[PDB]
């Protein structure tokens, strides 16, 4: 009897236009059966999180930038 | 920076632990055990005699069968986390599902049959066994039916990393149609109508029952009510349920937290107490009847 | 009326037979008891290679 | 009137001469003997098909057959090995209470208060069962009847009678009189020259097949008798009653000599058997069970399993291998 | 009295189609289970085929299936075989014999008179040897009919059976079982024999009583029939 | 396992089994009655208007469906014996006469045999019918005399239907155990020519209720 488990889109948002570099680090999240659609969520060293939108015009921006990061110094 | 501290964003929530829940499971796989024993029992001590109610009880008692499959390849798994597998989950919620269907249409069979014998009485075919297998079989070909359309895109799943491993739908690109359409068919086709068959059928037994002026007329209303009240209120909490989730995430319902995990202990919960309906469905019927009171004492008394 | 008189006359025919001492009949029951209780199953029962049930 | 006084004087002298007989019990007698322990008899083989309930059924001499009766108007013969059916008799009326297997396998007889004996022929060559002969000479229902041979038989019935039929020419040969009430039980002797029968005037008569007459009679009782059957031997007899005690007769000594009875048993006595060796005495109660006697010290030994229903009739094999009970559930059981 | 007598024999051109009938009076025929027997000109006798009560079991010899086919018409007292590309060595002539089964029955109790066909022109084996027997009346004599296989069931009963054929009649049922006479036969014959090995003895021979014997055995289908053994006076 | 005699055996078992049923589907559908009373009762008079050793039995039907009903006038001895045997009756009729009352207490005996039949051991779930009878003779004969001769505190006025209404009440205070059989009543008279409806409707209210007791679980 595994009907009981369920799964969610695991962000609640309101979020865009937070400044690239002081948002702190982040875990990648995929499309699945959770979520056909993409989704992404960023961390805080202030304990609390800061989910991101998948799509805006800000994002396509974003992604070098941030990735620069993880592939230098 | 130029922003602010704090936001909401409900990445952890009150959720049901596992083992609480497949202990509550294996309670109630306990009492089905113990009760299909016991009916089988009295039904084979008297198989020449058998009317096509009893048939109709009996066809209900293999779910004894099928919820210890199910358990076995639910507890199989959480034993050896590594002998998952793509293909055995189907045969999991397969059987779940027959378990939980065959219930409803069987006693749709028997409310037919109670109108058949009331209103059609002078006659002699609704007291024969054939007329039982055959509405057993219609209601075995339909609770199949509707499990084989419900275990179609069930797989296994990549939860995110060190907590994957876990069974869940893999319908894909339109999976949430898909999850909404499985609900809308078992609740159109469990609840609803089977509901306004055994409200119509008693209905007209109630009919023909007035006019007959017995002391029974308390007998027939009491037990009427309370199967058709019993059988509302223990399949009502898991729809209504669904269908607030169904609004959850079809944005009707204002999100939040503190209601998400609200909901999901209750479709949880509501989970556990239709398995226990469904287990205990044979002996409601068998006890308020009075030949299988009066076999009870035998047993009771040993 | 001569019906009660035969009636009457007819009713002490039981009384000629010979009498017997209890304790004797008691003694021929228990040896016909034990003499045959070798042979019915009801309480000695035979194996059941020669049960026909 | 002389006459009554001349009546109970005579069974005043029944009285003092029957006192002077006893000198010991057969409690002390038998109380040295070893107990016969615990006798647990299991249900092994259930016979199904009737519809209504079973009123009365007789083994045969090859104890493989048996015969049964029913309200749904059907005499079965079953084969008791295979649970297999050889014939399905249908009678005219449905108020059959009793039957009976000849010896020889060739004819089965019923009755009822249809107030007629029918007696059906098994071996035709026409292939089906088909009635031979209808004795229509009493004038009331019929209780029990027994089989002497294939041309004789004998039948009790309500009217206080019972008479000997020669089956060719349907005639009554020789009538029995002297019971005050209706004739219940009937049971033949190992030798047929004698046979015994109760009646519900508390009261058991020994008969003489031949002879047209009395040779003892038998009180015990304070209430109806329902069952009779003969000790093996031939020198004795048990009966059942409705004040829950089954008693045991002595006929050489025309004097009672055992009763088998408990606090805790009220209801009536419906059937009574011995074994073959005649240590063990089953009497089948109404309360939907059967009790087991040991014959010689009283004591209850066992008790088989009870039916759900009262229990009509009881019998037990000529080579005492199974004991075969009916009840009203429409089934029979084979016990051993 | 009982009858039972049959008709639709005459001549027939090979590879051709005949049907015959069985009719039966004078007893219940829906309660009994019917057989087909056939006999060559000069040889024994040979089972063709088997019908049940209620037509729920039918059986037929590895020679026939195929080709013939048994139906019966409780109704009207009426058997059929209709049989369908048939051969020269296909004429026998055709008796028409009834059975039934149930604790202490006598299977083969009765035998047809029988009619003529003609054409244009792994199982149990019985061995009965010795098929001429010189003998007089008043003289005791006997007959031995052997099994391949022993008949001795489980359940203690073997199942053979002996037939007599007087010249110029049916054949007629003596011994059912191997041990029970068969109804209305004299008490001078007896059987006896353990489960392969059998014997009919006749005390004191008649001249009434001379023909061939045949001894058939029906512990499982098909059944088969000795060569029979003549009588000589 | 089995030999070929068995298998025959066997297959002839299953047939007689299969007749029995048959059978007995179709005796589930001949009502049986049984007929009791003090006397005659003029109880014949329905099977004269509807003109369709041992025991009397009589037979007819209406309306696609089979009644056969028994008298126990035919007993030889004590009922004790005689009425243990019709445990399978599906309804009982009990007859009484109303101008029956003055004949030169007879109501005292009819209460005492309407109880002990009533409340007897056999009749456990037997529903109980009442036709009374000679209703146009009671109607004027009352004037004379009411039922005062034998019951006291009498109540009503001299009307016949309260006084009818009090004796209906009188018998059927008499089911103590009420709680497990049903009872009807209806009046009658020679010239009615309307008792099988009734019977009727009283049969079918025992078949509905035995078909929900035995098949429905109920």
């Given at each position: 009897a595994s009907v009981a488990t369920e799964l969610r889109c695991q962000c609640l948002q309101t979020l865009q236009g937070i400044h690239p570099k002081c948002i702190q680090s982040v875990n990648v999240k995929s499309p699945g059966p959770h979520c056909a659609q993409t989704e992404v969520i960023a961390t805080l060293k202030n304990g609390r999180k800061a989910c991101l939108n998948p799509?805006?015009?800000?994002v396509k921006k974003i992604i070098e930038k941030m990735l620069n990061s993880d592939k230098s110094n | 920076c130029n922003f602010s501290l704090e936001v909401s964003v409900c990445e952890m929530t009150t959720v049901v632990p596992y083992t609480w829940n497949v202990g509550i499971l294996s309670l109630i796989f306990l009492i089905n055990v113990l009760g299909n024993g016991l009916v089988t029992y009295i039904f084979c001590k008297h198989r020449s005699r058998a009317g096509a109610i009893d048939i109709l009880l009996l066809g209900i008692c293999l779910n004894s069968l099928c919820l210890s499959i199910s358990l076995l390849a639910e507890v199989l798994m959480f034993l050896f986390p590594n002998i998952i597998s793509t293909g055995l989950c189907r045969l999991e919620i397969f059987f779940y599902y027959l378990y939980v269907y065959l219930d409803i249409f069987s006693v749709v069979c028997v409310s037919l049959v109670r109108y058949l014998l009331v209103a059609?009485?002078?006659?002699?075919?609704?007291?024969?066994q054939s007329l039982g297998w055959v509405l057993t079989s219609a209601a075995w070909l339909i609770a199949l039916v509707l499990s084989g359309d419900a275990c179609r895109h069930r797989s296994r799943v990549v939860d995110p990393?060190?907590?994957?491993?876990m069974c869940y739908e893999n319908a894909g690109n339109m999976t949430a149609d898909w999850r909404l359409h499985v609900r809308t068919v078992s609740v159109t086709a469990g609840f609803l109508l089977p509901l306004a068959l055994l409200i119509l059928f008693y209905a007209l037994t109630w009919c023909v029952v007035r006019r007959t002026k017995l002391q029974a007329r308390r007998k027939v209303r009491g037990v009427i009510v309370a199967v058709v009240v019993l059988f509302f209120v223990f399949c009502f909490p898991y729809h209504v349920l669904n269908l607030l989730d169904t609004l959850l995430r079809r944005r009707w319902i204002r999100d939040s937290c503190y209601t998400r995990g609200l909901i999901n202990v209750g479709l949880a919960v509501t989970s556990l107490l239709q398995a226990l309906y469904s287990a205990v469905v044979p002996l409601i019927y068998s006890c308020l009847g009075s030949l299988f009171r009066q076999r009870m004492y035998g047993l009771f008394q040993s | 009326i001569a019906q009660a008189r035969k009636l009457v006359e007819q009713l002490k025919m039981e009384a000629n037979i010979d009498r017997i001492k209890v304790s004797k009949a008691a003694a021929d029951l228990m040896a016909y008891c034990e003499a045959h209780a070798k042979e019915d199953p009801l309480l000695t029962p035979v194996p059941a290679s020669e049960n026909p049930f | 009137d002389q006459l009554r006084q001349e009546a109970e004087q005579l069974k005043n002298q029944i009285r003092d001469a029957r006192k002077a007989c006893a000198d010991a019990t057969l409690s002390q007698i038998t109380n040295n003997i070893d107990p016969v322990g615990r006798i647990q008899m299991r249900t092994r083989r259930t016979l199904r098909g009737h519809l209504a309930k079973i009123y009365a059924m007789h083994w045969g001499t090859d104890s493989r057959l048996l015969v049964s009766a029913s309200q749904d108007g059907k005499l079965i013969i079953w084969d008791s090995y295979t649970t297999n059916k050889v014939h399905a008799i249908p009678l005219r009326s449905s108020w059959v209470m009793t039957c009976a297997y000849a010896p020889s396998g060739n004819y089965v007889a019923c009755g009822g208060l249809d107030n007629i004996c029918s007696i059906y022929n098994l071996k035709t060559r026409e292939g089906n069962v088909r009635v031979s002969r209808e004795l229509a000479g009493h004038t009331g229902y019929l209780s029990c009847c027994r089989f002497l041979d294939d041309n004789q038989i004998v039948t009790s019935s309500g009217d206080t009678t019972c008479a000997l039929w020669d089956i060719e020419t349907g005639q009554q040969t020789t009538t029995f009189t002297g019971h005050t009430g209706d004739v219940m039980s009937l049971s033949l002797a190992p030798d047929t020259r004698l046979f015994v029968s109760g009646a519900c005037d508390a009261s058991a008569k020994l008969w003489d097949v031949r002879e047209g007459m009395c040779r003892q009679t038998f009180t015990g009782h304070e209430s109806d008798i329902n069952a009779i059957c003969f000790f093996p031997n031939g020198n004795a007899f048990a009966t059942g009653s409705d004040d829950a005690t089954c008693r045991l007769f002595d006929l050489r000594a025309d004097q009672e000599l055992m009763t088998y009875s408990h606090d805790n048993i009220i209801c009536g006595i419906t059937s009574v058997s011995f074994s073959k060796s005649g240590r063990l005495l089953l009497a089948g109660y109404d309360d939907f069970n059967c009790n087991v006697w040991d014959a010689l010290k009283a004591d209850r030994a066992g008790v088989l399993a009870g039916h759900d229903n009262r229990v009509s009739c009881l019998g037990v094999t000529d080579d005492g291998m199974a004991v075969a009970t009916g009840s009203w559930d429409s089934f029979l059981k084979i016990w051993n | 009295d009982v009858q039972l007598v049959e008709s639709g024999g005459g001549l027939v051109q090979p590879g051709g189609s005949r049907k015959l009938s069985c009719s039966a009076s004078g007893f219940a025929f829906s309660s009994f289970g019917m057989h087909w027997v056939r006999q060559a000109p000069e040889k024994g006798l040979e089972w063709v085929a088997y019908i049940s009560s209620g037509s729920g079991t039918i059986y037929y010899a590895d020679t026939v299936k195929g080709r013939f086919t048994i139906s019966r018409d409780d109704p009207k007292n009426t058997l059929f075989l209709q049989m369908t590309s048939?051969?020269?060595?296909?004429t026998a002539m055709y008796y028409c014999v009834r059975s039934i089964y149930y604790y202490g029955s006598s299977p083969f109790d009765f035998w047809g008179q029988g009619t003529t066909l003609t054409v244009s022109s792994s199982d149990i084996v019985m061995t009965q040897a010795t098929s001429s027997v010189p003998v007089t009346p008043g003289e005791s004599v006997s007959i031995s009919c052997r099994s391949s296989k022993s008949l001795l069931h489980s359940n203690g009963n073997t199942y053979l059976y002996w037939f007599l054929q007087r010249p110029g009649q049916s054949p007629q049922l003596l011994i059912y079982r191997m041990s029970n006479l068969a109804?209305?036969?004299?008490?001078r014959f007896s059987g006896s024999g353990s489960g392969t090995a059998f014997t009919l003895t006749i005390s004191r021979l008649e001249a009434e009583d001379v023909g061939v014997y045949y001894c058939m055995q029906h512990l499982e289908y098909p059944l088969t029939f000795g060569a029979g053994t003549k009588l000589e006076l | 396992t089995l030999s070929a005699e068995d298998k025959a055996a066997v297959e002839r078992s299953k047939m007689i089994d299969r007749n029995l049923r048959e059978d007995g589907e179709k005796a589930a559908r001949e009502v049986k009655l049984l007929l009791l009373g003090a006397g005659e009762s003029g109880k014949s008079t329905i099977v004269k208007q509807m003109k369709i050793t041992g025991i009397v039995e009589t037979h007819f039907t209406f309306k696609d469906l089979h009644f056969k009903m028994f008298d126990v006038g035919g007993q030889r001895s004590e009922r004790k014996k005689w009425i243990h045997c019709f445990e399978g009756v599906t309804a009982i009729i009990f007859c009484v006469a109303?101008?029956?009352?003055?004949?030169?207490?007879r109501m005292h005996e009819s209460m005492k045999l309407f109880d002990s039949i009533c409340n007897n051991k056999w009749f456990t779930d037997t529903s109980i019918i009442l036709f009374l009878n000679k209703k146009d003779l009671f109607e004027e004969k009352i004037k004379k005399s009411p039922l005062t001769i034998c019951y006291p505190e009498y109540a009503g006025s001299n009307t016949y239907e309260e006084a009818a209404a009090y004796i209906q009440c009188q018998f059927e205070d008499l089911n103590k155990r009420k709680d497990t059989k049903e009872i009807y009543t209806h009046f009658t008279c020679a010239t009615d020519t309307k008792n099988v409806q009734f019977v009727f409707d009283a049969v079918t209210d025992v078949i509905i209720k035995n078909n929900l007791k035995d098949c429905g679980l109920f």
């Open positions: 799509a805006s015009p800000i | 059609y009485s002078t006659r002699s075919w609704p007291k024969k990393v060190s907590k994957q491993a | - | - | 048939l051969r020269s060595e296909d109804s209305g036969v004299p008490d | 109303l101008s029956d009352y003055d004949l030169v207490n």
